[PDB]
Design a protein around this ligand. Structure first.
Ligand SMILES: C/C(=C\COP(=O)(O)OP(=O)(O)O)CO
Ligand SMILES: C/C(=C\COP(=O)(O)OP(=O)(O)O)CO
Ligand code: SF4
Ligand code: SF4
Lengths: 401, 401
């Protein structure tokens, strides 16, 4: 189902229909703070952020970028950097060529280029710089910063229709048009199709789906997909997954970013985890072993089952660094931990390896299945440690080099 | 887009294409423990569980059900109860008619009815009881308990094809067929279309989408949609949202349950919250005011912004019980809290009411927008309390009776 697109290299990372969907994120430290920003780029990259964006908002930020890059490279960290430009990107790129060169990609927002005639000139200057330096660009529209002149143009087109659409629908048309027009203008200037990524983000899931279907149809470019301003906590996580899944399953989207608001003191790597979970849930990429477990019900003892499931999950997380190094393919491992005989054996047979605890009315023994067939039956104390040993033995055999 | 279906009443709650998608859940206490189970049904219902399921696994459980029901009614709690039957449902329903009568719905699993010839007789007996008592039934297939005789029949049909499908695909065909055959058999027995709900659950998102598309096509019934055995934590939440969204946006699904494994000590109401968030994220139902907020970046001061967003979210949660009582429609309230001028004003204008903090390079003032236009501009200490007062004033005006 994957939409074909040209490949756009962002540093060493290829983006497009022929490549895995790349996970990205954005820093939240002040870019002028070289120490804090370098540390957080490294943190995000180590969590799985294949590309990292940072705001390049003012001259102090611009002056910091080459140093951040130098420090990354000194540790052998090859993480591509995307500069986020608004209002003054043309001035910062012009004035600070070492910043322009140190970035791996420029983001432009067609709605933050300035007013009237100035918008076209500013756009052209940034595209010129990118062309001169061989850099890729994302043309990223966002409905929080929609070009007002385009909105009026589309509102007038709407008003001439025999059956005008709602104001909200016209906003979405304008957002798509903003990105498409800017894409076509960049191509016309001579920027290559191997240098252009597009996005057009809204904060409501159902709207996002509409928008990206239009962008996918109307353009050839790789698409950067995300639900902007998703918010805090569970709501942010749910909204992000809900918005992305329909599109991802239809084959639309080449890189994703999850726009979560961190709780105070929550690490900025949560968004990377959520991004990875979305792709893995959909069978698009595999990052780490996963545990399938039942909710538990009145058929099982709640504490014991919940404790075991949690213990298995924690052990897999502990073993992963080593495993990733020794056992190619282990990222695909599926482990089941189940509460009773109703679905326990069947679900366990669908995992690589799984355990079915005894629930109410059952003899106190726990079958273990691997590769769809009975492996052993556990009893007594120490079920969890025995099971984890069996998972280790399984991994070493199944994912051996 | 909503798929039309007959209405099935579960107690007082209507399920079907003409009705809101109902949120449901399942208890995890031992059903024999009347006190614990009654308490948890009440807890789940107060969190938003419009229907509550409990396992009816053995005779002690069956004997408890009428008492649970009596205690609910004594508090004026009209929450419909679904009994979850496996292996011995026909015996429990037969032997305990007061249990049969106290339930509002029976769940049958076509894969947990017994072996061979026994399966048909057991199925018929449960359907007979439901018919006698006027109860609705869910015929709920699950791939953890797939009828093995049907699987073999479909594996043989597959093997005759010019291009056989994979074993995994045949499992999914068998699961659909299990539910469809049982549905058709119940209808043929005389159970009404106003008494039959269907489900056919798997634990992988992309598979769920395939299954439910087939069930929706092949049947007329309302559908109970959920991703079974979704697991723990963020993974469970993401997988559930990812699996449900594509279907919900295509108009498929009449009731949902989110199958999360609670962490030890985590309340069983988390699944209800997640269910509600899925429906609200998709614009299908509204349960509570929501906060749209940016991720924050290097343009904003991280702590202050994150703290404000969290404070606003917490206050809305605190005010909701009162608000729900005074201000019809308040569940639809959208509040924005934004980090800087880039997207702050624009996003805030899309909310009912929103605040745009000042970010880097800006004067220290925070515009507030309501109904898409500037309401005021805040400065100094106490921005959060001033803003919350403005949100209160807004609510009282906008959602007045
Ligand atoms: C930093 C920012 C918005 C918040 O990030 P998002 O990643 O949500 O959206 P976008 O940047 O438009 O791709 C600027 O539009
Ligand atoms: C209790 C149980 C499974 C876990 O609940 P689920 O709600 O995940 O699945 P189902 O019951 O099949 O609707 C029995 O199949
Ligand atoms: S496997 Fe058993 S304990 Fe777990 S939710 Fe299913 S029926 Fe309940
Ligand atoms: S509104 Fe401003 S502070 Fe918030 S993420 Fe967007 S650009 Fe950064």
């Amino acid at each position: 189902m994957r939409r074909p697109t040209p490949t756009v290299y962002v540093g060493r990372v290829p983006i497009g229909g022929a490549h895995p969907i790349a996970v990205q994120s954005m820093t939240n430290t002040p870019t002028r703070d070289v120490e804090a920003t370098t540390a957080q780029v490294l943190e995000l990259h180590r969590a799985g952020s294949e590309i990292v964006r940072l705001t390049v908002n003012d001259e102090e930020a611009a002056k910091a970028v080459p140093e951040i890059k130098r420090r990354l490279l000194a540790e052998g960290a090859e993480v591509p950097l995307v500069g986020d430009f608004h209002f003054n990107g043309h001035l910062l790129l012009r004035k600070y060529p070492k910043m322009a060169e140190a970035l791996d990609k420029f983001r432009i927002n067609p709605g933050t280029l300035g007013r009237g005639r100035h918008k076209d000139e500013h756009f052209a200057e940034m595209i010129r710089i990118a062309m001169d330096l061989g850099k890729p660009v994302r043309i990223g529209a966002n409905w929080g910063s929609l070009d007002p002149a385009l909105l009026t143009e589309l509102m007038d087109r709407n008003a001439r229709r025999p059956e005008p659409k709602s104001a909200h629908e016209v906003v979405l048309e304008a957002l798509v048009e903003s990105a498409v027009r800017a894409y076509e203008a960049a191509l016309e200037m001579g920027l290559g199709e191997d240098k252009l990524v597009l996005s057009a983000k809204v904060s409501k899931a159902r709207d996002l789906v509409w928008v990206y279907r239009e962008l996918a149809r109307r353009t050839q470019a790789p698409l950067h997909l995300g639900l902007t301003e998703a918010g805090m906590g569970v709501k942010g996580i749910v909204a992000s997954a809900a918005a992305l899944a329909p599109l991802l399953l239809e084959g639309i989207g080449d890189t994703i970013r999850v726009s979560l608001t961190p709780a105070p003191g929550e690490p900025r790597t949560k968004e990377v985890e959520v991004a990875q979970e979305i792709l893995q849930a959909l069978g698009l990429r595999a990052f780490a072993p996963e545990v399938t477990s039942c909710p538990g019900c009145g058929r099982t003892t709640s504490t014991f089952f919940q404790e075991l499931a949690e213990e298995v999950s924690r052990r897999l997380k502990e073993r992963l660094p080593e495993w990733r190094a020794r056992y190619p393919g282990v990222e695909e491992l599926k482990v089941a931990v189940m509460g009773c005989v109703v679905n326990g054996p069947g679900e366990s047979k669908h995992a690589h390896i799984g355990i079915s605890l005894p629930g109410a009315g059952e003899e106190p023994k726990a079958p273990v299945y691997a590769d769809g067939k009975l492996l052993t039956i556990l009893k007594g104390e120490g079920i969890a440690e025995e099971f984890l040993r069996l998972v280790e033995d399984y991994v070493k055999t199944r994912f051996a080099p």
